[PDB]
């Protein structure tokens, strides 16, 4: 049992799934034939030991804290409270909220937007 920030295409990088007990190709074939639309960003994935990790897999779309920059056309934020440079449009805000809706258990779009503006403080950006 471990937590992996896996890729969107193949699943080779990351020494947290090559030592659990599942063949690489046996799961990579389904990860490539199922997540074809979600390739190009570090995507967290959830695994757990059931018998030998032959089932019970789920995806977690990329968090809106490094995507937030790209979602609002910002190249990179900062580590401390920095100057306000980026801004996400309202339509893009709804798009990001409804994309994160799969990831979150939040009961409404407003809860997700509040969470994003809560994590929108390390880069000085406004989420609305």
């Amino acid at each position: 049992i471990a937590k992996i920030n896996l890729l969107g295409g193949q699943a080779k990088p990351g020494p947290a799934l090559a030592s659990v007990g599942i063949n690489m190709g046996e799961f990579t074939k389904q990860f490539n034939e199922k997540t074809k639309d979600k390739q190009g960003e570090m995507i967290p994935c959830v695994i757990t030991a059931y018998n030998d990790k032959s089932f019970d897999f789920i995806l977690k779309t990329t968090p809106v804290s490094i995507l937030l920059k790209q979602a609002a056309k910002l190249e990179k934020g900062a580590k401390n409270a920095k100057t306000i440079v980026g801004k996400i449009t309202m339509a893009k805000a709804k798009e990001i909220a409804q994309y994160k809706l799969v990831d979150l258990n939040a009961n409404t779009v407003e809860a997700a937007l509040k969470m994003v503006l809560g994590t929108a403080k390390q880069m000085g950006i406004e989420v609305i």
Binding site: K12, G14, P15
Partner: peptide, 14 residues
């Protein structure tokens, strides 16, 4: 810089 680990017949290679 551990780029990752591949798996071979009886070994893991970093």
């Amino acid at each position: 810089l551990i780029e990752g680990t591949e798996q071979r017949d009886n070994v893991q290679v970093i």
